[PDB]
Amino acid sequence: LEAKKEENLADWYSQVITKSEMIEYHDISGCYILRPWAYAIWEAIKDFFDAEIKKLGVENCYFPMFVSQSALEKEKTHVADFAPEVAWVTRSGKTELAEPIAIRPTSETVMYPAYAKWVQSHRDLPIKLNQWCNVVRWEFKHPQPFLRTREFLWQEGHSAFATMEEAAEEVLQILDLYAQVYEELLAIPVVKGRKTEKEKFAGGDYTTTIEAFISASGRAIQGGTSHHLGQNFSKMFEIVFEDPKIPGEKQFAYQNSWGLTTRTIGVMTMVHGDNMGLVLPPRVACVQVVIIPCGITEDKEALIAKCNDYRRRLLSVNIRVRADLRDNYSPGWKFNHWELKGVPIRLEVGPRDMKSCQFVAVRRDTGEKLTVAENEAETKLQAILEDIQVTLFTRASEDLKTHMVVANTMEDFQKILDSGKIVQIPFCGEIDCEDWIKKTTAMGAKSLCIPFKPLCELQPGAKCVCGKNPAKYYTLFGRSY
Amino acid sequence: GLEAKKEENLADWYSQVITKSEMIEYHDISGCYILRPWAYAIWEAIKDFFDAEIKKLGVENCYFPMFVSQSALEKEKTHVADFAPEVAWVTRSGKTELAEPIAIRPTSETVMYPAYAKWVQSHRDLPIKLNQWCNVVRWEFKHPQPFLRTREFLWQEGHSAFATMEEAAEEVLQILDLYAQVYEELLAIPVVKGRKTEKEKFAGGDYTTTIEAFISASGRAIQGGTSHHLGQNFSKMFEIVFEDPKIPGEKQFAYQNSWGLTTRTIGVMTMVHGDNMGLVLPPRVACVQVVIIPCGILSEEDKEALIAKCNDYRRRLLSVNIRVRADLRDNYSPGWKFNHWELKGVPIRLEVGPRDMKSCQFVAVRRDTGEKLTVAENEAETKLQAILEDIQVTLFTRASEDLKTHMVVANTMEDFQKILDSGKIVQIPFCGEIDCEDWIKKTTARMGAKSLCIPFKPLCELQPGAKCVCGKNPAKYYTLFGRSY
């Protein structure tokens, strides 16, 4: 690895995702190849998230990718902010189609016409559906793998309820699931809050989000969204049901939508990566422990059989293990090779170590070498793997606890912002006031989220940073990624 | 209920079954359809089986971009010219025309193999075995059918690259056998293995092996999956070269394969095993093998014990890994739940009446035969298990017999069209020419019979010196002919 993280971060990120065999560059700008090393992280998120949403009653399905030109113009506010971001298919071959067809930037306009046919009574509720698919967002910003891409994989769960109470209860349920994915699988602490009126989902009531922080660039990034659509989309697609007790009364449905993309892997690379390469948390690592024979220079057949000893012993306790037993490369090459890929534990077996009933476990995060007896293999490695997961989170929590501050004035909010930090400021919550913030912070700082539990309680009567309107709440501000 | 009959109008019967079973919902755009969770669970059941089998062969999962460039598609010329009229093109961002239209993938050959060239440099960089589960757009202007003939479908596509051609030719038949296991062991659908003719083969590749199924209701056959050996025709155009391990400087081209399996599997399952009373699911891919339905609806205290007895059955059937659901919904009638789960094709319906609860009795109803057999509260773990395996074999026996009745052999063009108009598929001696294959489709329609596959094990060996049905060229093999979807 030639680039450093504190110096050239952009070139460091490109070398890390490629040398770790996670990302391969295509030739259409905005598209990237998810190699099996990075795809195994996405499946680990799928098998965890799917097991949680199916407890809540959500069922997986799949909807068409194509949207007709008439279906996109059904919800006016939904097509406003999405019009410049949508890609249209106008012909197949050299034959122009009947009507231009769009690729889905989101499946709200595709499913809700079907929700209207399925919802006809109170018994046909609640509907809870989810799908793992791909979407196209034709944005004119600089693409970066995982983080910002035109095409990306995600999940989108759409749920219609008969009451606003049960709909509001699922919004916070899904948002806390997204928090578990970042904190308990990726070891990334995030801040849960609400979006402002300018950066909320178009055509919806309110948007909840989780904001992760990257100390290498001093920028924050949104990791997931969970919107409460209210009756906005159900009033335009005629998603109504009959009241169970009152005869003849028909009430509109209350709908929610929530999503989580593959930038979860990107934030993991940005938060835990170092100048030695990738760093995978043991919870999502494709290979947790790699076994490498050392000191090879004819008693070698026993050393290989002893590496196969640790390999099968770790498989029975259900620990993802890989045995690199290639004779083409030196043990020093394998050390560099698997450190770039982020394998949490390196299991070194030497000739004298084998005959001594001991081995060496090297931690990817700290580089510490711990000699472990042969009998304690399954139990000590299970303890170090759990310790690496927490260590990556505590160190990430320390960088988030110290880079998030409070500022009540504009110049002190401006000063701390240029020091690579995100700030919570008393904010009035107006669009015309937020545009001025991004105009004077310059690249300019945008709103991140209105945190549920802010760092400090807002003083009653305290004004906003603009000095003209009274402040409504503390809003986390900063530059986005 | 069901407003159509399978023998009367199969087209309307197909629309009623796929929708009333809550599998397919129609989309605003023709040719595109919605995969509801009941149909998606059938595809997920195929996924967990086929994924674990290719994992044992060294294949790893990944995901490639859905957009292909105009330069990469025009590399292999024979491949693009055959796919060109069905390639959806992205030509607009918002209300602005792009300076260079990009295409949506109808297959990921021209997308992955450029990356295969960068990865393959040494001999140890082989073999590369990569698979991906994704959707594919093939915007054909022909008559669309749900599952069977859709413009967008979910599928899997594995792309392998080997150093020697022996391992490549070996894996083609390995994947082809896995496709047969998906249809025979799981879907209980008998398939015939064979190679595709030069007309129906994969353009730009070497040879194409495929599986074929028969639908007795329409008398038409259908392709269930393909496994193409690409040879070096693709590695030569994308420069996928590896240095020779012994000969210094000399670089060799890699032998490649490609295989795909689509969601058409579900449509073939519904077309073959579906009856006039709804869907019929094989117990292997059954999302719900047995359904507990509390029937008999007075005594609310005993009625609570009836729901309690339902949970005991659902709790005991889980210990034997029998997929069970207890429909304890107090907002639906038991008669509603009967035909509702019958339309979904649940293999067994476990009904429990109040008199049966107070007498060590319960009734199990088979979906394939409709046998209402009363079983005691003792063999609930063994009898239902014996029925589930008896349902799987019975469905496969009816379909394997239907194939033997309608797959015959004819040696003259006269006997060809006669048995073809009887709703059967026929194995004929064929010369293998593209022009002769086009003449067969035109003559047998005056609706045209197409070549299905060249069976590896035909019904009869070609007699030495046999002539084709055309009479102008010697026959090379027996080919399965018949009308197709």
Ligand SMILES: Cc1ccccc1CNC(=O)c1nccnc1NCc1ccccc1C
């Ligand atoms: C901003 C930009 C710049 C250049 C090109 C394209 C794009 C657009 N693409 C995205 O915003 C993006 N890309 C990958 C993964 N997640 C994403 N959204 C993030 C996202 C979207 C929806 C729900 C939840 C989340 C976390």
Ligand SMILES: Cc1ccccc1CNC(=O)c1nccnc1NCc1ccccc1C
């Ligand atoms: C023929 C037609 C008519 C009208 C509109 C569109 C289409 C095209 N549709 C397909 O080719 C299709 N559709 C769904 C499932 N499998 C498919 N191919 C079948 C298939 C392809 C590749 C590998 C394996 C299989 C079994």
Ligand code: PRO
């Ligand atoms: O696009 C979005 O942001 C929401 C969440 C997933 C579905 N729609």
Ligand code: PRO
């Ligand atoms: O499209 C096809 O038919 C082949 C098989 C999967 C990849 N390409």
Ligand SMILES: [Sr+2]
């Ligand atoms: Sr009213």
Ligand SMILES: [Sr+2]
């Ligand atoms: Sr009302």
Ligand SMILES: [Sr+2]
């Ligand atoms: Sr492999």
Ligand SMILES: [Sr+2]
């Ligand atoms: Sr040469």
Ligand SMILES: [Sr+2]
């Ligand atoms: Sr050569």
Ligand SMILES: [Sr+2]
């Ligand atoms: Sr001749």
Ligand SMILES: [Zn+2]
């Ligand atoms: Zn203000």
Ligand SMILES: [Zn+2]
């Ligand atoms: Zn001929």
